[PDB]
Write a protein that holds these residues in place. Structure first.
Motif, short mmCIF file in Angstrom:
data_model
loop_
_atom_site.label_atom_id
_atom_site.label_comp_id
_atom_site.label_asym_id
_atom_site.label_seq_id
_atom_site.Cartn_x
_atom_site.Cartn_y
_atom_site.Cartn_z
N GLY A 1 0.78 -1.27 0.03
CA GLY A 1 -0.21 0.12 0.01
C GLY A 1 0.72 1.14 -0.04
O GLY A 1 0.24 2.33 0.26
N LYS A 2 2.12 1.05 -0.17
CA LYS A 2 3.07 2.31 -0.20
C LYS A 2 3.28 2.74 -1.74
O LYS A 2 4.12 3.66 -1.85
N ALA A 3 2.68 2.25 -2.66
CA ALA A 3 2.84 2.79 -4.04
C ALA A 3 1.47 3.16 -4.49
O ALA A 3 0.55 2.36 -4.55
N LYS A 4 1.50 3.92 -5.65
CA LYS A 4 0.41 3.95 -6.80
C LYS A 4 0.68 2.94 -7.58
O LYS A 4 1.76 2.68 -8.03
N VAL A 5 -0.46 2.47 -8.41
CA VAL A 5 -0.11 1.43 -9.35
C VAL A 5 -1.53 1.72 -10.39
O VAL A 5 -2.80 1.66 -9.81
N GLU B 1 -0.18 15.75 -11.51
CA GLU B 1 -0.37 15.85 -10.23
C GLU B 1 -0.54 14.57 -9.47
O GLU B 1 -0.10 14.26 -8.34
N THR B 2 -1.06 13.68 -10.20
CA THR B 2 -1.27 12.28 -9.88
C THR B 2 -0.19 11.28 -9.94
O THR B 2 0.45 10.42 -9.30
N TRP B 3 0.53 11.59 -11.39
CA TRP B 3 1.64 10.73 -11.59
C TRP B 3 3.02 10.96 -10.84
O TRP B 3 3.34 10.12 -10.38
N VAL B 4 3.09 12.48 -10.49
CA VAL B 4 4.29 12.51 -9.83
C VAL B 4 4.08 13.55 -8.61
O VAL B 4 4.83 13.50 -7.62
N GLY B 5 2.82 13.92 -8.30
CA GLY B 5 2.52 14.75 -7.45
C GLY B 5 1.73 14.19 -6.03
O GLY B 5 1.03 14.82 -5.47
N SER B 6 1.41 12.65 -6.24
CA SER B 6 0.80 12.08 -5.01
C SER B 6 1.49 12.24 -3.78
O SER B 6 2.72 12.39 -3.69
N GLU B 7 0.66 12.05 -2.63
CA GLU B 7 1.47 12.33 -1.39
C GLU B 7 2.33 11.04 -1.09
O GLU B 7 3.43 11.18 -0.25
N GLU B 8 2.31 10.03 -1.69
CA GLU B 8 3.19 8.96 -1.80
C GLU B 8 4.25 8.94 -2.88
O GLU B 8 3.82 9.42 -3.86
N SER B 9 5.40 8.43 -2.57
CA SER B 9 6.47 8.37 -3.36
C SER B 9 6.42 7.77 -4.74
O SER B 9 6.22 8.50 -5.90
N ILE B 10 6.13 6.61 -4.69
CA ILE B 10 6.30 6.08 -5.83
C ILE B 10 5.17 5.96 -6.75
O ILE B 10 4.04 6.30 -6.34
N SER B 11 5.25 5.93 -8.12
CA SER B 11 4.31 5.54 -9.17
C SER B 11 4.46 4.53 -9.97
O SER B 11 5.63 4.26 -10.32
N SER C 1 15.65 15.24 0.72
CA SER C 1 15.48 15.09 2.34
C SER C 1 14.70 16.23 2.54
O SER C 1 13.93 15.89 3.68
N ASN C 2 14.60 17.36 2.20
CA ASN C 2 13.62 18.44 2.63
C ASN C 2 12.43 17.79 2.70
O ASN C 2 11.71 17.27 1.99
N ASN C 3 11.50 18.30 3.81
CA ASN C 3 10.19 17.98 4.01
C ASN C 3 9.18 18.23 2.90
O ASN C 3 9.48 19.48 2.18
N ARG C 4 8.50 17.39 2.34
CA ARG C 4 7.70 17.57 1.19
C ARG C 4 6.67 18.63 1.42
O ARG C 4 6.25 18.71 2.43
N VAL C 5 6.59 19.30 0.32
CA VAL C 5 5.75 20.52 0.26
C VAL C 5 4.48 20.56 -0.69
O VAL C 5 4.96 20.11 -1.76
N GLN C 6 3.58 21.02 -0.19
CA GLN C 6 2.44 21.16 -1.17
C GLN C 6 2.83 21.71 -2.21
O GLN C 6 3.07 23.01 -2.09
N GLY C 7 2.35 21.43 -3.53
CA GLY C 7 2.77 22.14 -4.76
C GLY C 7 1.26 22.46 -5.55
O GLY C 7 0.26 22.04 -5.18
#
Ligand SMILES: Nc1ncnc2c1ncn2[C@@H]1O[C@H](COP(=O)(O)OP(=O)(O)OP(O)(O)=S)[C@@H](O)[C@H]1O
Ligand SMILES: Nc1ncnc2c1ncn2[C@@H]1O[C@H](COP(=O)(O)OP(=O)(O)OP(O)(O)=S)[C@@H](O)[C@H]1O
Ligand SMILES: [Mg+2]
Ligand SMILES: [Mg+2]
Lengths: 630, 99, 272, 199, 51
Positions: free
Chosen positions: A183-187, A352-362, B87-93
């Motif tokens: 649950g740590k990645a978008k898929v 915003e969803t491909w690269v802007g999600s709150e979680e890191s991976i996509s 490393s810097n804390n993620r910032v809303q864009g």
């Protein structure tokens, strides 16, 4: 003190040693006060000098002196040596503290992935800026680490405690990584699941040339110039109806991303090709005698004078809009475009969803993609990512202030030497102009020989898993920045998992044993299991359904039940039931959910009171009812 | 190794630094008539900044340690820093403008 | 005991053992508590090191061996090498129990399809989960016996004791398999027989392209634009005159496997 | 019912005899059957009849004529899709041909495991060596001198490559084509000819 | 063969012409077609000389 041998004769470079030792293992040589650590891949039978073989040909214990780096003045280890060994000096095996210093560092830049072969306690420190700025590649045989290795690195780099603003993307054609990241990645996949989105690639966000390469097969005639003329008017027209910031009629281009309705394109283009003309020579639409694809009936016929020889693609295009297998591209769910060209949203959400999600991976799993145009879409996605971060490189969200790392699985089929696809024309640019925008790359391929040499030349460092065939070992060895003879000779015998890292992203080429991810967190592909599926008894098939679906281009039977509730409990997790329609829904690990039909609910009660699930479910349900799996 | 040997020969003097791969160490040797074992046998263990000069512009070839230029006058490309920017804390864009 | 010789060279993987050993036979190399199994590559002057025959031009007792895998601590045969061998180690021959260990497998996905060359009692287990999912291909000379090795395998796959639900199709162009499967297959062909059904491929189960490719030899002008119009018309009427679920006046395409009358096509189109 | 006969019969194996085909179109039919078997299994991967519950296996004889490097036929297109997407829907394939070098090199490389029987001409051996991955240098210099049925299996279907000896089928179960026997048909005494019927 | 121009809207080297138009409109090539001082007017005079 581990004494073995000492030097007794000199032959220019061959410094001959009489004895009283692993291959890719360092040796220590103290000279007064400065210690010399390095590799001597010539020892014993492979090092005895040809000049002296006449005397003692049946003996093999002889070494040579050639180093890699010198210990500083109690400071650290640097490549090169201030002075070279001399007569009388003796070689000692390296010690664990020496391994700590040679591979250790005081810099926080490095990150640890695996361990050194000799002593596991040591960490395998690998740079990160060079592992994302200078690009890299992963290579090895088909059965070696490969994907089990790629996940571990992405599962270590993308930690939130240490890198709370990471940003990467993964291409996995088999879709085998969504299992490791629970649950740590978008898929995103073409056909969704319970909690996964749609990989929708709005077609209006494509350059005109790429658009004609997926929907028309490469028109190369005067008709090709008719489509470009037609699309421009639609894109130009939508601007006048809806105001957009910063682009007007003057600076408009055929290739700018302004949404347009393809359904209007095909319908107007197709209808203006064949229809009765009340008055001869009149091209007006008023002389001829829409939410759904249904076209109104047309009377028998003179023929319209406004047409060309593009009948085949135009009728072939209509087919591409029907089948559900291409629903992702032409029927983008939330980006579906109505007739007037006004959609609900824009690429903002897509980016915003491909690269802007709150979680890191996509993750983009492409198994559901038709393999015919898999290459063309790979290039399209790369273009979108690069360009978006290109004209927004000063803003605070781009790649300059938050670099990217696009990962590509199974690349050897896409960067061929003679490959004429658009993927390589897109991958070359990032490897060239991606350095100063921070766009990385990680290449995966089980057969490097087919990969274009110029592409494999420009990658910063190389991950070297086991590689069997001789044809490929010679090709990969030909694009190595810093190669060792004692280390690269054992490339065809690496055990599973452990890889050899070579390039500018580490101080030294080292044989690391990457830590395997936790059990249950691994990349697994759920392909049909013949041995477990052929062995079960026969079942009278009802092919009257298989025909019906094959005609309808559907994938779900018309007897499914949707609104059943479930309650948590081989590894059965959840079990449902419904006495109204005698339907028993069951759920297993990996999210597999079946729907057995017309089963007495006495078994349902029995299973709940059976308290013997797993061994007892197969007793009277394995092959005793008709089930329409979901 | 990939550069055309036709144009390489006409060059007068060559500065050679650390060379690890054996494939390229041979090609450089082919563009110099003064095949000296000591000069190029020590090529693959040259410290950063070291060089060996061969050509007519130098009276005699040998290894020299070029003095690095002072701090504040040193080449460095301003490529973005990965670990510092992640490393810097993620910032809303807001992507309304990036688009 | 069983002794071959000693390792007189090492290069990471490639090794050149000297005797005191068949071309394909494995070689066993114990190291302390684990053993290294290897493959021979050449014999004689092909394995001699580059710099030895100068003083002994006719010393030819050398063999080149390669490393494939390694046996764990009574666990299993894991590919690779924990610790490579060095100069002056011991060597041993691969005996009957070892062949079982290296080639054995307790998994139930494997099936026996032959016997290894050295010892006949060793089943030639080959994964079937992989053989059916990754892919396969049989290649050889003309008289080398392919179709006999495509039946000795294709007949062990569809056994009725282990795989009662198997499924297979065959394409034999010379008709040389129907004789092998006397009472195990459903043979089809063009000429009916007493107990062999006749292959029938309805012409309406085909796409527009394929039907145009076998019937009219390939049309490109307005003819291709006239035949398609007619086929669509015929598949429209068969829907009106008979009921097929799901297919409507819009979801119907030129290439849906719906029945149409070919004779009516030619007759009406030709008569007009 | 048509499909039930091909795939759903009470006997596992189906055998399509094409020796009677008018060979001017023999290629297109091979591209017709593969399409129907693929779509039917592909579009019903949920129900218990599809390829996810009873995996298929298509074996093709003399594949070097329809999978040419530059062939313009329709069979090669079909044999490429199953070679590409079959792993998802469990539709394997077996290829038989005595001329490897004429097989397209982009299809021959995507086959996981290979059976390497005798091969003499060097235009093939040098081409089979160009697609097998775990290529030993002691068991691949042995191709032309194998016995009949002494195949070599290299790939991932086995732990490591092996030089097996397939067990022949029981006598009377072997594959036997029925060609006219000229020696037994030319040596009998001539019979009076009635060519009126032949017309 | 046939807004900033007064006229109101009404060889096979055309696709070069459209490709040529891409360079003109692009700000990223303005260093070359739209040199700060070296842009050529219709009269043909340049504000400065290459000397
Ligand atoms: N460090 C490890 N230790 C033990 N076993 C491992 C290790 N890494 C991988 N494996 C095992 O070897 C199997 C090989 O499968 P994968 O790791 O997926 O390699 P792969 O098939 O090349 O990946 P792709 O991208 O689908 S080709 C794995 O499934 C593991 O069972
Ligand atoms: N597995 C086998 N074991 C022993 N002999 C075999 C085997 N397969 C074929 N043969 C022998 O080869 C003869 C059978 O007919 P062949 O024409 O040689 O084989 P084939 O399979 O029909 O040839 P092709 O061109 O590969 S189809 C007999 O002499 C067999 O003994
Ligand atoms: Mg994988
Ligand atoms: Mg044959």
């Amino acid at each position: 003190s581990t004494y073995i041998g000492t030097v007794q004769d000199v032959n220019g470079a061959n410094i001959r040693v009489v004895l009283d030792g692993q291959i890719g293992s360092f040796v220590r040589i103290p000279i007064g006060y400065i210690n010399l650590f390095g590799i001597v891949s010539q020892v014993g039978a492979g090092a005895v000098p040809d000049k002296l073989l006449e005397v003692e040909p049946y003996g093999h214990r002889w070494i040579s002196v050639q180093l890699v780096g010198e210990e500083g003045i109690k400071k650290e280890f640097e490549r090169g040596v201030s002075q070279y060994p001399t007569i009388g000096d003796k070689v000692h095996i390296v010690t664990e503290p020496d391994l700590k210093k040679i591979y250790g560092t005081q810099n926080k830049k490095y990150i640890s992935l695996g361990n050194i072969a000799s002593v596991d306690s040591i960490p395998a420190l690998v740079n990160i800026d060079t592992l994302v700025t200078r690009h890299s590649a992963v290579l090895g045989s088909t059965g070696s680490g490969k994907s089990t290795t790629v996940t571990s690195i992405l599962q270590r780099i993308s930690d939130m405690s240490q890198f709370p603003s990471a940003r990467i993307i993964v291409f996995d054609i088999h879709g085998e990584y969504a299992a490791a990241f629970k649950g740590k990645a978008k898929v995103y996949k073409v056909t969704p699941s319970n909690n996964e989105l749609k990989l929708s690639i709005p077609y209006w966000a494509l350059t005109c040339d790429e658009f004609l390469s997926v929907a028309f097969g490469g028109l190369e005639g005067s008709g090709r110039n008719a489509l470009i003329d037609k699309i421009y008017e639609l894109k130009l027209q939508t601007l006048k109806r809806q105001e957009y910031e910063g682009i007007n009629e003057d600076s408009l281009t055929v290739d700018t991303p302004i949404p347009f309705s393809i359904h209007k394109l095909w319908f107007d283009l197709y209808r203006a090709e064949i229809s009765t003309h009340y008055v001869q020579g009149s091209h007006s639409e008023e002389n001829e005698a829409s939410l759904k694809v249904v076209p109104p009936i047309y009377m028998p016929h003179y023929l319209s004078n406004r047409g060309k020889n593009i009948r085949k693609p135009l009728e072939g295009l209509a087919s591409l809009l029907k089948d559900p297998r291409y629903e992702f591209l032409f029927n983008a769910d939330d980006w579906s475009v109505n007739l007037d060209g006004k959609t609900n949203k824009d690429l903002d959400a897509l980016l915003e969803t491909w690269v802007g999600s709150e979680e890191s991976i996509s993750i983009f799993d492409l198994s559901g993609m038709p393999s015919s145009i898999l290459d063309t879409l790979i290039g399209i996605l790369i273009r979108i990512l690069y360009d978006s971060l290109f004209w927004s490189r000063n803003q605070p969200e781009g790649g300059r202030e938050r670099p990217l790392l696009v990962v590509l699985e199974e690349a050897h089929t896409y960067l061929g030497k003679d490959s004429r696809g658009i993927a390589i024309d897109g991958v070359r640019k990032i490897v060239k102009e991606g350095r100063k925008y921070g766009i990385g790359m990680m290449l995966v391929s089980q057969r490097p020989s087919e990969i274009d040499s110029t592409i494999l030349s420009q990658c910063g460092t190389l991950f070297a898993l086991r590689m069997n065939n001789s044809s490929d070992r010679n090709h990969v060895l030909g694009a190595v920045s810093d190669s060792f003879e004692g280390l690269m000779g054992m490339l065809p015998t690496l055990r599973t998992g452990e890889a050899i890292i070579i390039g500018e992203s580490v101080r030294l080429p080292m044989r690391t044993i990457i830590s395997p991810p936790p059990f249950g967190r691994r990349p697994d592909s759920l392909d049909p299991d013949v041995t477990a599926k052929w062995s079960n008894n026969r079942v009278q098939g009802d092919y009257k359904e298989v025909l019906t679906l094959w005609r309808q281009k559907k994938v779900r039977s018309q007897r499914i039940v949707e609104n059943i509730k479930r309650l948590p409990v081989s590894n059965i997790l959840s079990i449902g039931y419904e006495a109204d329609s005698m339907t028993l829904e069951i759920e297993f690990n990996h999210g597999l959910v079946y729907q057995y039909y017309d089963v007495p609910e006495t078994l349902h009660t029995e299973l709940l009171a059976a308290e013997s699930h797993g061994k007892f479910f197969n007793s009277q349900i394995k092959n005793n009812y008709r089930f329409s799996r979901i």
